[PDB]
Design an enzyme around this catalytic site. Structure first.
Site, PDB file in Angstrom:
ATOM      1  N   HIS B  65       0.821  -1.259   0.000  1.00 16.59           N
ATOM      2  CA  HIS B  65       0.000   0.000   0.000  1.00 16.59           C
ATOM      3  C   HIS B  65       0.821   1.258   0.000  1.00 16.59           C
ATOM      4  O   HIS B  65       0.335   2.279  -0.464  1.00 16.59           O
ATOM      5  CB  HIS B  65      -0.965   0.021   1.207  1.00 16.59           C
ATOM      6  CG  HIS B  65      -1.804  -1.228   1.323  1.00 16.59           C
ATOM      7  ND1 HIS B  65      -2.845  -1.546   0.445  1.00 16.59           N
ATOM      8  CD2 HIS B  65      -1.758  -2.223   2.255  1.00 16.59           C
ATOM      9  CE1 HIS B  65      -3.394  -2.689   0.848  1.00 16.59           C
ATOM     10  NE2 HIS B  65      -2.735  -3.105   1.921  1.00 16.59           N
ATOM     11  N   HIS B  90       5.496   6.875   6.437  1.00 16.14           N
ATOM     12  CA  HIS B  90       5.204   6.396   5.075  1.00 16.14           C
ATOM     13  C   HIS B  90       4.705   7.550   4.227  1.00 16.14           C
ATOM     14  O   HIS B  90       4.591   8.661   4.747  1.00 16.14           O
ATOM     15  CB  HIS B  90       4.154   5.254   5.123  1.00 16.14           C
ATOM     16  CG  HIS B  90       2.830   5.756   5.642  1.00 16.14           C
ATOM     17  ND1 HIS B  90       2.510   5.704   6.980  1.00 16.14           N
ATOM     18  CD2 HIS B  90       1.867   6.473   5.028  1.00 16.14           C
ATOM     19  CE1 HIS B  90       1.335   6.340   7.182  1.00 16.14           C
ATOM     20  NE2 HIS B  90       0.934   6.833   6.003  1.00 16.14           N
ATOM     21  N   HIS B  92       2.349   9.035   0.552  1.00 16.92           N
ATOM     22  CA  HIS B  92       1.230   8.899  -0.424  1.00 16.92           C
ATOM     23  C   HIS B  92       1.555   9.777  -1.581  1.00 16.92           C
ATOM     24  O   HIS B  92       2.122  10.872  -1.399  1.00 16.92           O
ATOM     25  CB  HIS B  92      -0.081   9.446   0.253  1.00 16.92           C
ATOM     26  CG  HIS B  92      -0.438   8.709   1.501  1.00 16.92           C
ATOM     27  ND1 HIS B  92      -1.289   7.608   1.505  1.00 16.92           N
ATOM     28  CD2 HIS B  92      -0.095   8.926   2.807  1.00 16.92           C
ATOM     29  CE1 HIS B  92      -1.433   7.163   2.776  1.00 16.92           C
ATOM     30  NE2 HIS B  92      -0.739   7.965   3.582  1.00 16.92           N
ATOM     31  N   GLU B 103      -2.768  13.679   0.318  1.00 20.78           N
ATOM     32  CA  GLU B 103      -4.109  13.309   0.869  1.00 20.78           C
ATOM     33  C   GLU B 103      -4.861  14.555   1.270  1.00 20.78           C
ATOM     34  O   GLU B 103      -5.982  14.793   0.783  1.00 20.78           O
ATOM     35  CB  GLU B 103      -3.911  12.349   2.037  1.00 20.78           C
ATOM     36  CG  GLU B 103      -3.147  11.080   1.623  1.00 20.78           C
ATOM     37  CD  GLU B 103      -3.705   9.876   2.340  1.00 20.78           C
ATOM     38  OE1 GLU B 103      -3.375   9.744   3.519  1.00 20.78           O
ATOM     39  OE2 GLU B 103      -4.492   9.153   1.730  1.00 20.78           O
ATOM     40  N   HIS B 116       3.587  10.937   6.169  1.00 20.06           N
ATOM     41  CA  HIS B 116       2.927  10.776   7.505  1.00 20.06           C
ATOM     42  C   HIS B 116       3.885  10.151   8.453  1.00 20.06           C
ATOM     43  O   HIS B 116       4.422   9.093   8.130  1.00 20.06           O
ATOM     44  CB  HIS B 116       1.703   9.893   7.358  1.00 20.06           C
ATOM     45  CG  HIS B 116       0.648  10.587   6.586  1.00 20.06           C
ATOM     46  ND1 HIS B 116      -0.369   9.930   5.897  1.00 20.06           N
ATOM     47  CD2 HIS B 116       0.423  11.902   6.448  1.00 20.06           C
ATOM     48  CE1 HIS B 116      -1.192  10.849   5.375  1.00 20.06           C
ATOM     49  NE2 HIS B 116      -0.696  12.047   5.620  1.00 20.06           N
ATOM     50  N   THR B 197      -6.272   7.396   7.283  1.00 19.62           N
ATOM     51  CA  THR B 197      -6.756   7.580   5.921  1.00 19.62           C
ATOM     52  C   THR B 197      -6.744   6.281   5.139  1.00 19.62           C
ATOM     53  O   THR B 197      -7.043   6.279   3.936  1.00 19.62           O
ATOM     54  CB  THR B 197      -5.893   8.613   5.162  1.00 19.62           C
ATOM     55  OG1 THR B 197      -4.563   8.039   5.050  1.00 19.62           O
ATOM     56  CG2 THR B 197      -5.805   9.936   5.841  1.00 19.62           C
TER      57      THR B 197
HETATM   58  N1  LIG Z   1      -2.292   7.181   6.465  1.00 17.56           N
HETATM   59  S1  LIG Z   1      -2.342   7.361   8.050  1.00 17.56           S
HETATM   60  O1  LIG Z   1      -3.672   7.864   8.421  1.00 17.56           O
HETATM   61  O2  LIG Z   1      -1.194   8.205   8.472  1.00 17.56           O
HETATM   62  C1  LIG Z   1      -2.053   5.801   8.834  1.00 17.56           C
HETATM   63  C2  LIG Z   1      -1.731   4.665   8.057  1.00 17.56           C
HETATM   64  C3  LIG Z   1      -1.366   3.487   8.758  1.00 17.56           C
HETATM   65  C4  LIG Z   1      -1.063   2.290   8.000  1.00 17.56           C
HETATM   66  O3  LIG Z   1      -0.114   1.527   8.329  1.00 17.56           O
HETATM   67  N2  LIG Z   1      -1.827   1.988   6.978  1.00 17.56           N
HETATM   68  C5  LIG Z   1      -1.562   0.764   6.274  1.00 17.56           C
HETATM   69  C6  LIG Z   1      -1.260   1.113   4.857  1.00 17.56           C
HETATM   70  O4  LIG Z   1       0.065   1.583   4.833  1.00 17.56           O
HETATM   71  C7  LIG Z   1      -1.403   3.455  10.170  1.00 17.56           C
HETATM   72  N3  LIG Z   1      -1.096   2.270  10.919  1.00 17.56           N
HETATM   73  C8  LIG Z   1      -1.343   2.267  12.363  1.00 17.56           C
HETATM   74  C9  LIG Z   1      -1.340   0.874  12.901  1.00 17.56           C
HETATM   75  C10 LIG Z   1      -2.485   0.047  12.852  1.00 17.56           C
HETATM   76  C11 LIG Z   1      -2.388  -1.265  13.366  1.00 17.56           C
HETATM   77  C12 LIG Z   1      -1.167  -1.732  13.895  1.00 17.56           C
HETATM   78  C13 LIG Z   1      -0.034  -0.920  13.950  1.00 17.56           C
HETATM   79  C14 LIG Z   1      -0.130   0.389  13.429  1.00 17.56           C
HETATM   80  C15 LIG Z   1      -1.746   4.533  10.904  1.00 17.56           C
HETATM   81  C16 LIG Z   1      -2.085   5.714  10.244  1.00 17.56           C
HETATM   82 CL1  LIG Z   1      -2.468   7.004  11.291  1.00 17.56          CL
HETATM   83 ZN   LIG Z   2      -0.723   7.959   5.599  1.00 16.37          ZN
END
Ligand SMILES: NS(=O)(=O)c1cc(C(=O)NCCO)c(NCc2ccccc2)cc1Cl
Ligand SMILES: [Zn+2]
Ligand SMILES: NS(=O)(=O)c1cc(C(=O)NCCO)c(NCc2ccccc2)cc1Cl
Ligand SMILES: [Zn+2]
Lengths: 262, 262
Positions: B65, B90, B92, B103, B116, B197
């Site tokens: 992703h 990571h 986008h 985003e 992010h 997101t």
């Molecule tokens: N775009 S975002 O809003 O900044 C965001 C994305 C991810 C993420 O890992 N998405 C998976 C696709 O890459 C995340 N992961 C948090 C997470 C969830 C479960 C276990 C460990 C970490 C937390 C956030 Cl805030």
């Molecule tokens: Zn993100």
């Protein structure tokens, strides 16, 4: 239809009951330079039978999601590869504290509201319901509406809003010339293949969005944004009909063709 | 990880298997003047433990992703009510034909890409996984990215992209000062309560979007857009990792607070 534009049954959930809402070719879209391309084959449309007799009357209905005017099948567009006959027009809008409810955007900006005049391929299909499942079965003309001068032609519709405040209510509107709802220089438009912007989101619409907006006043927008309810007259949890526009969609590799080169 | 940003399993379908994707408080949103409000309570954050040991290695993955860099839990934000410890960063982005894949938007405009830096409330919860669906659980720092001068610091990540071309692949990045990825005048930011997101879209993120963008070169932006695939190496139907941003969500009767007025 209990889909809505707000809350648990709002647009990120429509695909749960209407699979084409999560499919390809969705509308609306943001019209921006990277995805625009001039096509000189986009010649001018002609609007036939749009000057409806003032001694006839046409049904205006609140369908729980917009206000729609039924149009006669003698009204058609000429210039596409089939005849497309009108079936209805309706609008999308925001709300009184944020009058920015167009569906299509241009270079990221919403307009105050948007008019859609829905037509179907009458050379091929008996009615719009049948057409709605078929390849280019529908063609919609979209007019961007911006807050400006009072518009007497749009008021031929808005002057009846207090008679269609609730879902299922009907009123009659004397005929008028629907071409008065179109902007200046209709020869300049955007054209693309997309979908219904409401459930069931069928990817069967040839979209024409005119380049130039029309104006209606703040007071006409406020009437449109305050007169109508999504719910029936006797519903004990009324919902205002506001913010009835879908967010713009990913482009799915599509271009938008323009009839104007600059 | 079945979810995607294109085709049947794209963002309009996320809410089937991730019901919070159709719930409240969804991100990202358009940041525009109507909905901005200065809040003098919004003082500068401090970035502590961001100068990562150059004698330690940090795991870079392609998770199908985005490209993610694991961060250590001694890295944290100070300035919020609880301490928020880093877990990963990571990005986008869009694609080379439409290189506008942030985003968040500003006055309806996308930036080229967005970084992010994800943190979790380590005062209340033991890890990011556990915090992710909990009250006050997450805090994200978002940096808007535009095209301009070459950026050596982003190249500390971008130089490794070729080793994480396909899903499941991993590389080691030597520690460097992550604060070098932040823009000028980090005291100037937007702040709002929203959501992940991506699936599962939990509404548990305190967003900080810095006011000012950073710049990367045209070559660095093209590398980010072209280096990665969503698919495993041996997939006979490869899919390029492009357009990995979610469309902006409706955001009505709410404010985004700013640490700046001018
Ligand atoms: N775009 S975002 O809003 O900044 C965001 C994305 C991810 C993420 O890992 N998405 C998976 C696709 O890459 C995340 N992961 C948090 C997470 C969830 C479960 C276990 C460990 C970490 C937390 C956030 Cl805030
Ligand atoms: Zn993100
Ligand atoms: N917004 S739009 O994309 O212009 C569009 C909307 C409707 C419509 O009536 N939506 C119901 C809620 O207001 C429509 N209905 C015509 C139709 C569709 C399916 C069956 C019968 C009639 C056709 C179109 Cl193209
Ligand atoms: Zn419509």
């Amino acid at each position: 239809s209990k889909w809505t534009y707000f809350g648990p049954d709002g647009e990120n959930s429509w695909s749960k009951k209407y699979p084409s809402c999560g499919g390809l070719l969705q509308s609306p879209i943001d019209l921006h330079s990277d995805i625009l391309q001039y096509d000189a084959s986009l010649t001018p449309l002609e609007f036939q039978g749009y000057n409806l007799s003032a001694n006839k009357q046409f049904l205006l209905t609140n369908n729980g999601h917009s206000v729609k005017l039924n149009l006669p099948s003698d009204m058609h567009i000429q210039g596409l590869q089939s005849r497309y006959s009108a079936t209805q027009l309706h609008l999308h809008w925001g709300n009184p504290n944020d009058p920015h409810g167009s569906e299509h955007t241009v270079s990221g900006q919403h307009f105050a509201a948007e008019l859609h005049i829905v037509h179907y391929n009458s050379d091929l299909y008996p009615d719009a319901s049948t057409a709605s499942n078929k390849s280019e079965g529908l063609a919609v003309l979209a007019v961007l509406i911006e807050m400006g001068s009072f518009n007497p032609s749009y008021d031929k519709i808005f002057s009846h809003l207090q008679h269609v405040k609730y879902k299922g209510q009907e009123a009659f509107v004397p005929g008028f010339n629907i071409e008065e709802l179109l902007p200046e220089r209709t020869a300049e438009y955007y054209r693309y293949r997309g979908s219904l912007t409401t459930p069931p989101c069928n990817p069967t619409v040839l979209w024409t969005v005119f380049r130039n907006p029309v104006q209606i006043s703040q007071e006409q927008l406020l009437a449109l944004e305050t007169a109508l309810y999504c719910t029936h007259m006797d519903d004990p949890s009324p919902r205002e009909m506001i913010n009835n526009f879908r967010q713009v969609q990913k482009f799915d590799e599509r271009l938008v063709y323009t009839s104007f080169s600059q």
